[PDB]
Write a protein that binds this DNA or RNA. Structure first.
Ligand SMILES: [Mg+2]
Ligand SMILES: [Mg+2]
Ligand SMILES: [Mg+2]
Ligand SMILES: [Mg+2]
Ligand SMILES: [Mg+2]
Ligand SMILES: [Mg+2]
Ligand SMILES: [Mg+2]
Ligand SMILES: [Mg+2]
Ligand SMILES: [Mg+2]
Ligand SMILES: [Mg+2]
Ligand SMILES: [Mg+2]
Ligand SMILES: [Mg+2]
Ligand SMILES: [Mg+2]
Ligand SMILES: [Mg+2]
Ligand SMILES: [Mg+2]
Ligand SMILES: [Mg+2]
Ligand SMILES: [Mg+2]
Ligand SMILES: [Mg+2]
Ligand SMILES: [Mg+2]
Ligand SMILES: [Mg+2]
Ligand SMILES: [Mg+2]
Ligand SMILES: [Mg+2]
Ligand SMILES: [Mg+2]
Ligand SMILES: [Mg+2]
Ligand SMILES: [Mg+2]
Ligand SMILES: [Mg+2]
Ligand SMILES: [Mg+2]
Ligand SMILES: [Mg+2]
Ligand SMILES: [Mg+2]
Ligand SMILES: [Mg+2]
Ligand SMILES: [Mg+2]
Ligand SMILES: [Mg+2]
Ligand SMILES: [Mg+2]
Ligand SMILES: [Mg+2]
Ligand SMILES: [Mg+2]
Ligand SMILES: [Mg+2]
Ligand SMILES: [Mg+2]
Ligand SMILES: [Mg+2]
Ligand SMILES: [Mg+2]
Ligand SMILES: [Mg+2]
Ligand SMILES: [Mg+2]
Ligand SMILES: [Mg+2]
Ligand SMILES: [Mg+2]
Ligand SMILES: [Mg+2]
Ligand SMILES: [Mg+2]
Ligand SMILES: [Mg+2]
Ligand SMILES: [Mg+2]
Ligand SMILES: [Mg+2]
Ligand SMILES: [Mg+2]
Lengths: 148, 185, 223, 51, 53, 157
RNA sequence: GAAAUUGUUGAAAGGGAAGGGCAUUUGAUCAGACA
RNA sequence: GGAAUACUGCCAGCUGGGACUGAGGACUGCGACGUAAGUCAAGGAUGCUGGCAUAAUGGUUAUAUGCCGCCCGUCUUGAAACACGGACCAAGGAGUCUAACGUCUAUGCGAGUGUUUGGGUGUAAAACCCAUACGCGUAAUGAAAGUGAACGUAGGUUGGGGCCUCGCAAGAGGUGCACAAUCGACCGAUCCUGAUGUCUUCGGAUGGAUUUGAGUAAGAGCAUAGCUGUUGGGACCCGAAAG
RNA sequence: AAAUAUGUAAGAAGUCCUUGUUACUUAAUUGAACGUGGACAUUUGAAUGAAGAGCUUUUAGUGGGCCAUUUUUGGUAAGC
RNA sequence: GCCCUGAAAAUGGAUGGCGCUCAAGCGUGUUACCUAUACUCUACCGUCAGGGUUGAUGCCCUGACGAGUAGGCAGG
């Protein structure tokens, strides 16, 4: 709101907060991004290194979500099981009946390897698991079921 | 006239009361200002200043942080104090029992202490039990993991995160970021 | 509750009575200590003369300095040294232990200050009337020996005269006993500086530099 | 609430530093020193009055 | 000087006496009696201006 | 309400004084003020009258007679500081004066018959003694004034 | 029915501007404290 | 030969005159003087007396006297300026609002968060309510194909507040979050190494490298708001010669 | 070969004893690093001061200067 | 050394003026005096700080400090 603004406090003092020498003029130094390569260069290197030039390949008509592969970690992985039903599978810890986790139904496209899991075996239906993702699942007696 | 050796009328750079208007926060202060003044209890002092702190200075302590702290030798039975809010953490599984004193508990965190058999205590309750702060563990969150801290000290060869509104190749990746185009940072 | 006050009261009234006669004992011993010290030097001078020798006094260990110059237009080296001796203000003054380490702080500072060798009668009259202590910053007037004893007692020095004795003798706690004294804020000399123009050496026309014994007449007009 | 100057106000001069009492009462603001007869030898005055 | 200081503190602690290992600066001076035997003060005068060229 | 009320208000209890240490000690008059010294009255109704000093009252004033039958000044109070104390002194031995004190002149148009007697009483004694030294009666009837060139910082009085 | 600006009347001041500040004189004027 | 005096210095020696000040408001303190009971000039003025009880003090104002005072505003190293604007008065008259942002702050919730595109609803632009998605965050790293975060109580060392034990204390030992320094481990990039295999050229185990990254190492974010700063906009207000 | 100016040092992050680690290095169990365990805290190793020290973020204004002493360059000189 | 000559410019005129000659001049010494928003002590306003204590933006005790364009913040 207005009455909180400094420009209210500057009523009565000439020149607002702007200084009497260099005043406040329209656009000294140029509008917008002007002179990023000349008089603003010191600012652009240092705080925006790499601003100018090209890098990489062009990609024509790239559609996002062609790449859609949301990632999930063994760090959690057990959150996909509803919290009530969680404790029963955890105490059970049997290969005969082990919980089914369909990661793609939960909206994940790849299972990554962060964290540790408890020794309970699980059934992970997923596309794309990382190599350490699988290996920790099997060490707890689980398996990875490739799906799509 | 004087030749001063120090800036006159310079005020202490420390918070004298919290910037909040929350009346219950004020009360918690009013308690601990009494506590701090009339007791020795260095614990009380720290908590007094702790109550003044700004949100950026009161980063959440997760429920796993408390758990790993209780694994210090001889700490198992202390009661944790967190001036701030405590968060739930799914990543741990076996959580101990103990007791926690905090400003605020998140739903998950409350259920996760309680379902472990523990207890939820506010700071006034903690006060009545430990007037001198006996057998307390004080915990602070990691305030330096904040996003904004990525950008502090930005510079050439400083390795910090530039301020950028969009990310990928062709976004500030070229001239000055790589030996091949000009120089490197 | 009604009786136990006369317990704590009659207790301190006796521990006061005790601290008192200790000061009365000490101050008597200081009086003898000075009276005989001076008296020896006099005769030692007489003795040298009778022997056809010359007795040379020992150089003074103790020097009092008051800043007679304003706070404007001071060179930066002297401006530091002036602060490091705690004279940031015109006419204010402190004591300095005399060693070669502080002797050069008197060389660099010389055009802005007048200094000399203070007499017992000065140091006494300084500390009684203008004596102030430094207690958690704040400047405390020394009106009761307890104030001294509180802060300086760990060194000995429970009496304003123990302070005065500690000063004029230099000795073990001079550093701390001195630094306890708040710099003496003096008025301008009543009766004048006796020279037309101050800032010139005492040798040259007075005011600024080491006037040796003459610092005393000065400080006592200011004080 | 008032600085009082011990060099005036005898109440205070006694409040700090007893032996003020003794000092005054024994005088010794005065107190003649003893009387000695040492005479400076010869060479001293020979050089004192020298050119 | 730390060798010297360590060894000074040892010969002091072995005898149980005071240490004082921190140097003091030069202290002003002490009272002397200089004699006149053999030295009679030889009195001096300023000298008239003289050209030597 | 035309003006929002105070959230505080002060206490209408009146505080008691602290217990003040000021003794009432007795006045010391300057050496020159001794009963029977002729005074020069420096101000007041009778200013410039030459007057005889009798008794030092307990309210710090001086008992003055002057005496009435000579200069018209009656028995009366006078203040220490408004008086020049001369070097000529008539002896008051023969003057009772024990009866005149603070409450004598106590405010209690007309002149009391005891006053008038006490006047003649004290004066008949005084005029007697004044007659012992020649010209002292004339001197006391005359009025004092600084003539041209007088210098009170020189004049001995 | 404001201001600039003007008529009359009333008080005042004024030896080449006026107006300001501190201080008291003078004149004019006026508030505050007791039954 | 015996003094005196000057000079300089000291006295917790005694005393005369004048000036300004009287803060504080029961008591607490340090004392002094007394054989004593008491007394005091000892942590800030009391006693006694007089006059007036109103324009008397005082305020206001006009005048007079003494001393002092250049015209503001702006640019400027420098303005009273022989720099510029301003004859006078009134009323108007200039850092805004928006989109997206940096910090900091407060609030809500928190590994999540944002009800208001929309639907329900209504006392009807409000308030109240909600399904699916979506945006940001929860994974980084390569131009890219792609790969993708625990040797170890999520490591060692050096400091760390708090807490714990011993201790009457002074201290001694234990644990040590945040944070800082430093050595290590993990993930991507780059360069080696090239095992078991295999279809013979695919595959890439294992162990390395003064190399590298806006990374991991028991999450902090998301949203709403405020000051301040950013940029685009007529962009604090008025102004070109032009096109 | 000065004066004034200037670098470094005046301890606990130190010192000493004992003897662990290693692919470095040595002919060598030699050294070089980094450690375990033991010893020494009064003055805790000059003076003075210190009214506190350390640390982070963020943003205004400025980027015409001028003068005095001394040092000093161009100029006969200058309110250059 | 002081004094004289050397020593010529434009409105009328400046040891600041008047004036001053064993000075009111020049050199030097000795005191006494005058008076700054500076020093010293007190009262008051405010700012900062330290401490106490259950109109809480509270009440109390204690010390130090106070220049300012351009500019920042703060209370109004
Ligand atoms: Mg402003
Ligand atoms: Mg301003
Ligand atoms: Mg203006
Ligand atoms: Mg500004
Ligand atoms: Mg401007
Ligand atoms: Mg500018
Ligand atoms: Mg160019
Ligand atoms: Mg992991
Ligand atoms: Mg005088
Ligand atoms: Mg002078
Ligand atoms: Mg007659
Ligand atoms: Mg009008
Ligand atoms: Mg007209
Ligand atoms: Mg008028
Ligand atoms: Mg006029
Ligand atoms: Mg004034
Ligand atoms: Mg003699
Ligand atoms: Mg004398
Ligand atoms: Mg009073
Ligand atoms: Mg008046
Ligand atoms: Mg003038
Ligand atoms: Mg201009
Ligand atoms: Mg310009
Ligand atoms: Mg101007
Ligand atoms: Mg001009
Ligand atoms: Mg112009
Ligand atoms: Mg004009
Ligand atoms: Mg415009
Ligand atoms: Mg804008
Ligand atoms: Mg046109
Ligand atoms: Mg064109
Ligand atoms: Mg800038
Ligand atoms: Mg410029
Ligand atoms: Mg000039
Ligand atoms: Mg002339
Ligand atoms: Mg003159
Ligand atoms: Mg003469
Ligand atoms: Mg002369
Ligand atoms: Mg003024
Ligand atoms: Mg305070
Ligand atoms: Mg504190
Ligand atoms: Mg407080
Ligand atoms: Mg309270
Ligand atoms: Mg409060
Ligand atoms: Mg306030
Ligand atoms: Mg408070
Ligand atoms: Mg000041
Ligand atoms: Mg200011
Ligand atoms: Mg300032």
């Amino acid at each position: 709101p207005s009455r909180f603004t400094k420009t209210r406090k500057h009523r009565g003092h000439v020149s607002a907060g702007k200084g009497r020498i260099g005043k406040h003029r329209k656009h000294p130094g140029g509008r917008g991004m002007a002179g990023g390569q000349h008089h603003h260069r010191i600012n652009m290197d240092k705080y925006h290194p790499g601003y100018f030039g090209k890098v990489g390949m062009r990609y024509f008509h790239k559609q996002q979500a062609h790449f859609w592969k949301p990632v999930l970690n063994l760090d959690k992985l057990w959150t996909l099981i509803p919290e009530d039903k969680r404790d029963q599978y955890l105490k059970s810890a049997s290969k005969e009946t082990a919980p089914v986790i369909d990661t793609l139904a939960a909206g994940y496209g790849k299972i990554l390897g962060k964290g540790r899991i408890p020794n309970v075996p699980v059934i992970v239906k997923a596309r794309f698991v990382s190599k350490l993702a699988e290996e920790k699942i099997r060490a707890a007696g689980g398996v990875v079921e490739l799906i799509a | 006239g004087i030749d001063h050796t120090s800036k006159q009328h310079k005020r202490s750079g420390h918070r004298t009361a919290p910037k909040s208007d929350n009346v219950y926060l004020k009360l918690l202060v009013k308690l601990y200002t009494f506590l701090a003044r009339r007791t020795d209890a260095p614990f009380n002092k720290v908590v007094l200043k702790a109550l003044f702190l700004s949100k950026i200075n009161r980063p959440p302590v997760s429920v796993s942080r408390i758990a790993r702290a209780l694994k210090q030798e001889g700490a198992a039975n202390k009661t944790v104090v967190v001036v701030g809010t405590v968060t739930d953490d799914a990543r741990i599984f076996e959580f101990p029992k103990t007791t926690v004193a905090a400003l605020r508990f998140t739903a998950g965190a409350r259920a996760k202490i309680v379902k472990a058999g523990g207890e939820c205590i506010t700071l006034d309750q903690l006060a009545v039990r430990a007037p001198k702060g006996q057998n307390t563990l004080i915990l602070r969150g990691p305030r330096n993991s904040r996003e904004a801290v990525r950008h502090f000290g930005m510079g050439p060869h400083k390795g910090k995160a530039p301020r950028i509104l969009s990310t990928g190749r062709k976004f500030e990746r070229a001239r000055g970021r790589r030996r091949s185009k000009g120089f490197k940072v | 509750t009604a009786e136990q006050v006369a317990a704590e009261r009659a207790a301190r009234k006796a521990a006061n009575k005790e601290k008192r006669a200790i000061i009365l004992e000490r101050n008597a011993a200081y009086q003898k200590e000075y009276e005989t010290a001076e008296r020896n030097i006099i005769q030692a001078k007489r003795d040298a003369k009778a022997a056809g020798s010359y007795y040379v006094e020992a150089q003074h260990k103790l020097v009092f300095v008051v800043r007679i110059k304003g706070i404007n237009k001071i060179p930066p080296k002297p401006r530091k040294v002036l602060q490091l001796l705690r004279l940031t203000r015109i006419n204010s003054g402190t004591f300095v232990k005399v060693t070669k380490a502080t002797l050069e702080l008197l060389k660099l500072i010389e055009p802005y200050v007048a200094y000399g060798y203070p007499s017992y009668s000065t140091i006494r009259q300084l500390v009684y009337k203008r004596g102030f202590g430094k207690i958690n910053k704040q400047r405390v007037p020394l009106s009761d020996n307890a104030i001294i004893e509180a802060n300086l007692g760990k060194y000995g020095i429970l009496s304003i005269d123990d302070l005065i004795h500690e000063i004029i003798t230099v000795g073990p706690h001079f550093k701390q006993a001195n630094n306890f004294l708040w710099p003496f804020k003096l008025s301008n000399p009543s009766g004048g500086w006796g020279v037309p123009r101050k800032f010139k050496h005492f040798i040259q026309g007075g005011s600024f530099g080491n006037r040796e014994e003459f610092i005393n007449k000065l400080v006592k007009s200011m004080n | 609430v008032l600085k009082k100057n011990p060099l005036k106000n005898k109440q205070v001069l006694l409040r700090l530093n007893p032996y003020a009492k003794v000092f005054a009462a024994e005088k010794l603001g005065s107190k003649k020193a003893e009387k000695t007869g040492t005479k400076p030898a010869a060479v001293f005055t020979e050089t004192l009055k020298h050119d | 000087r730390v060798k010297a200081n360590a060894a000074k503190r040892a010969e002091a602690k072995a005898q149980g006496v005071a240490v004082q290992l921190k140097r003091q600066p030069a202290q002003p001076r002490e009272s002397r009696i200089v004699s006149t035997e053999g030295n009679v003060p030889q009195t001096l005068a300023p000298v008239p201006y003289e050209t030597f060229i | 309400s035309a003006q929002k009320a105070p959230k505080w208000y002060p206490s209408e209890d009146v505080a008691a004084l602290k217990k003040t240490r000021k003794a009432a000690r007795p006045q010391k008059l300057r050496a020159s003020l001794v009963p029977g010294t002729v005074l020069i009255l420096l101000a007041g109704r009778f200013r410039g009258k030459r007057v005889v000093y009798l008794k030092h009252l307990e309210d710090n004033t001086l008992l003055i007679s002057g005496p009435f039958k000579v200069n018209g000044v009656p028995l009366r109070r006078v203040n220490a500081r408004y008086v020049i104390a001369t070097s000529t002194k008539v002896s008051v031995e023969g003057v009772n004066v024990e009866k005149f004190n603070v409450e004598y002149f106590a405010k209690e148009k007309e002149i009391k018959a005891e006053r008038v007697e006490d006047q003649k009483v004290v004066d008949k004694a005084l005029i007697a003694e004044i007659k012992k030294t020649p010209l002292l009666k004339q001197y006391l009837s005359a009025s004092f004034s600084l003539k041209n060139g007088d210098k009170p910082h020189m004049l001995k009085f």
